[PDB]
Design a protein around this ligand. Structure first.
Ligand SMILES: Nc1ccn([C@@H]2O[C@H](COP(=O)(O)O)[C@@H](O)[C@H]2O)c(=O)n1
Ligand SMILES: Nc1ccn([C@@H]2O[C@H](COP(=O)(O)O)[C@@H](O)[C@H]2O)c(=O)n1
Ligand SMILES: Nc1ccn([C@@H]2O[C@H](COP(=O)(O)O)[C@@H](O)[C@H]2O)c(=O)n1
Ligand SMILES: Nc1ccn([C@@H]2O[C@H](COP(=O)(O)O)[C@@H](O)[C@H]2O)c(=O)n1
Lengths: 248, 248, 248, 248
């Protein structure tokens, strides 16, 4: 973790490409999720403090991350599975044996559950109203559970249709295998309940209509272009799948 | 919890409406259970320290409590499920995943089990003689496990038939989905075993024939009337039920 | 428990009636097992520090003990189930939910397992050679795990046939529902491994041929006769059995 | 364990018979595995700090070890099962009840899992690439988890075919019931990650081409010949198997 430190939570919405870099803090940790590596440029750098993946694609994402790391495209300290310990959302065996199949990773819920009131908030809305927070918000909850007090948001656009993501997701392998109000109310609850501060790094995003923009500390960050980079998720061998079958 | 503090345990018997308010302590926490919100007046106020619900109706009660809270009809700090960890009394999956479905609530048994001798007392009578204590007594056991030493009882009438409850329970949704000696001996065991004091707030009740009445400290409590209040339990969506199905 | 204190472990062999009372320590705790209450006299008094029962009859024994206690025939501080956590010896569900059905009792194995080497000794002989220690020895292992250093043995005769027990076991309800060397080697292992001392209180028993007799401290113990005492195990209601069915 | 102390990890490759005894440290603990007792001479002495056995043959190996100990052929302090907590590699029931069937033994994984990064390294290669480390490397990981900092390797030849083992394995009972690069990279990872030192005791082995030879401290070790020794694994009774059946 990194209590006291600043963290940038990045969703993969089109606003990820519209970061106002003059509002970027001088120092920060970076939380990325799902298909972040699909980005055509290092919008937030090669170093991540943590990467999050849904349980449904964790097996393949973990495999892909190791390739990303080995190829020196990205680095990360923590690897998180964004689970909730809910029968209708995750394979039960997957969760129970998680640390034995992915020893250097964590069950996101182990941190998420430390925020008892938000866990209740999420569970009540998901279970009774079919209202679920997105990965962007999940990461904010984990960031808070880890000790962060200043969270800078980017790439959270609430699926505006105009543009689905900050990159082309029409990838062969990936293809083979929520609302604005739900997320906003959740972030509000998080800010007011645990007394942390949320900042927005993208002035053109819808998020900017609800949370204040980060100050203009102005940093000299450099955005590096990517070349011959990995832009599709990798598929493990049939043998591998056979070994992980029990965890579906 | 609230060790040292005073607590009023309220059953929903007809004596709930016959509280001798001059015997009400100047300060206290309030424990309510099941259909308490059906009351036509705030006999013990809007603020509860804890509310208890049987496992069989917890799914719907939790849903209803959130509505009660959102509508500002009641407030509570703790939400308790009055379970016993008994196969013939509760769905096993319900208990095992309880904290993951209701994060801000507690399994009453986690406190009840701290009183090893009373747990034994209850288990022996329930299992071998089919003699079960009511919710009123269960709450007394939890109150003691939480540190309370002075317990004031109300709404405990041992089902006198003359009047079943302190309100009309002939509610549409509710309809859709023990003995005097058993409770009295249990309360006696509780008082003599953990050295706490039990007081009765209703002089016209049968309970008053067994436990002493609370002193006449005389307080200036105000009983507020209710209007357009929630007086029936709410039923969650079929979608919600589908998600909670495994916990029956 | 009672570390430093002296304990008398009583099997139910015929030597229970041939205790040399002049060798009885001035002060002691008493461990009894199974059908001890069948005795026609209080050979070791009415007060027991602990009573042990096999898992196969625990449901009925617990029921019977409560009757013995209520009727003031015996008193006990601890109630132990002599289990081993072995699939072929005990119902698995029985062990897993034990503390929820019998809150004031203990799983003997929770103490037995603290003696890692003896647990290994027992397991190896039971599993691979079908050589099992009797309840008398099991109790010695639990006594040691509890802190006792001086153990006095009685009623351990290794089933000499001449007389099976110190009382008539031809009881209606009971009827309805190992070797010398195995026990002796186990006691030797216990004495030499945990550095405790074993004494024999019955000079006419076979046990006296292997372990030294307790010194003649000479006490003024009084053996009280029993009258209209409980001399058969009690059978719980069909309703009770229905509730405990899952634990067979 | 034995932090600070030196340990000799012995595989059973043909190099076990080609130890350069002048490079043997003056004092050390010894880790042996599987069919080590098949050796025709005490190449590393009769005293072992620990012996390791795969879960598939643990039932029979444990039985055999007890015979080896009883017959005074070997002595050991620890008995380890080299497991990984992987469904496709071990019987799940075997692992869950392990400490109840073999109280004086340990699940190797309980120590192996303390090295989170190596556990991840092993799991990733095994699961996704079908690349598994041998027992020799597993023991190195356990040695490190136990506090050892200087590890001397012997009997690790990476199955050169020329000679499969340092002894004849064509044994009746045994018969009835990986790569160089995988092991070497794993040992490298271990050395560089936990900052320990690896030494090779066999100059003629392939291992000597990758890790440095131990210094010539020169000791006066004596290699004792064996006579009428146990050279085949023992088979437990059908009764025993019947009791351990659930753990396959
Ligand atoms: N148009 C978009 C697309 C992504 N996002 C967010 O970015 C995350 C993107 O990854 P996913 O769409 O794979 O979940 C979402 O969890 C959410 O927080 C957004 O807010 N608006
Ligand atoms: N007539 C009545 C009705 C309720 N009660 C008590 O009030 C509680 C009421 O809720 P229930 O009847 O829903 O359990 C009981 O658990 C018991 O303690 C009573 O003692 N006499
Ligand atoms: N003849 C007898 C009978 C009982 N005993 C012992 O007394 C205990 C008696 O209870 P059970 O026969 O019910 O097990 C045995 O576990 C054993 O220690 C004995 O050693 N010789
Ligand atoms: N030829 C051989 C044979 C054994 N070995 C090693 O010795 C161990 C031997 O026991 P197993 O072949 O039974 O596993 C292997 O786990 C491995 O570390 C080796 O490296 N080369």
């Amino acid at each position: 973790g990194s209590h006291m430190k600043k963290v940038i939570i990045a969703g993969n919405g089109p606003s990820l490409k519209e970061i106002d870099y003059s509002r970027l803090p001088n120092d920060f940790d970076v939380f990325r999720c799902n298909q972040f590596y699909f980005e055509d440029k290092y919008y937030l750098g090669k170093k991540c403090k943590a990467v999050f993946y849904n349980p449904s694609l964790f097996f393949e994402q973990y495999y892909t991350l190791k390739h990303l790391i080995q190829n020196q495209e990205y680095e990360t300290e923590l690897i998180m599975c964004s689970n909730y310990n809910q029968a209708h959302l995750e394979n039960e065996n997957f969760v129970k044996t998680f640390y034995d199949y992915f020893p250097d990773a964590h069950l996101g819920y182990d941190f998420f559950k430390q925020l008892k009131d938000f866990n209740a908030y999420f569970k009540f809305h998901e279970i009774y109203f079919n209202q679920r927070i997105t990965s962007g918000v999940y990461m904010c909850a984990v960031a808070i559970a880890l000790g962060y007090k200043e969270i800078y948001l980017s790439g959270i656009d609430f699926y505006q249709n105009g543009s689905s993501y900050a990159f082309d997701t029409k990838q062969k392998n990936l293809l083979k295998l929520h609302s604005k109000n739900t997320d906003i109310k959740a972030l509000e609850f998080l800010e007011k309940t645990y007394k942390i501060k949320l900042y927005c790094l993208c002035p053109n995003s819808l998020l900017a209509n609800f949370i204040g923009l980060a100050p203009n500390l102005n940093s000299n960050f450099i955005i590096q272009e990517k070349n011959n980079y990995t832009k599709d998720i990798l598929i493990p061998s049939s043998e591998a799948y056979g070994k992980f079958s029990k965890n579906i």
